[PDB]
Amino acid sequence: GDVEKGKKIFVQKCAQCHTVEKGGKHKTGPNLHGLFGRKTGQAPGFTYTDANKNKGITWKEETLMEYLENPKKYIPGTKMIFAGIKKKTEREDLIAYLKKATNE
Numbered sequence: 647g648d649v650e651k652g653k654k655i656f657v658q659k660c661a662q663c664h665t666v667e668k669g670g671k672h673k674t675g676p677n678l679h680g681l682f683g684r685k686t687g688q689a690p691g692f693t694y695t696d697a698n699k700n701k702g703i704t705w706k707e708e709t710l711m712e713y714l715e716n717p718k719k720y721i722p723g724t725k726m727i728f729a730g731i732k733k734k735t736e737r738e739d740l741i742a743y744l745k746k747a748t749n750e
């Protein structure tokens with residue numbers, strides 16, 4: 647995916663509720679540093695719904711592709727109130743940005 651395009655999506659659509667840097671603040675949603683390769687619901691210091699705590703999957707390209715298409719369908723009960731991203735390419739780009747920015 648295209649990291650530049652993903653950055654723009656993140657800033658426009660996600661930053662309202664999320665940070666990505668190491669040690670960054672929780673907002674409505676959790677800080678996302680360290681996301682890849684970790685189970686759902688594991689950002690230190692954030693109180694998740696039971697649903698996000700218990701989904702029991704590992705975040706990686708394939709699972710983020712599905713989640714970001716329709717968050718509520720993937721994690722019923724989630725408190726992330728955000729419209730799914732329909733376009734596959736946009737999800738790919740966003741995920742490439744996340745994979746970089748959440749792993750500095």
Ligand code: HEC
Pocket residue numbers: 656659660661662663664674675676681685686687688689693694695697698699714723724725726727728
């Ligand atoms: C506020 C209105 C949000 C917007 C906009 C986005 N997200 Fe979000 N996210 C939000 C909350 C409140 C939560 C926790 C939900 C819960 O039920 O406890 C989340 C969670 C995520 C996760 C899961 C994190 C985990 O550690 O399992 C991811 C991967 C995530 N959010 C990503 C994300 C992206 C990339 C967004 C823009 C497309 C985005 N979120 C928007 C709140 C909000």
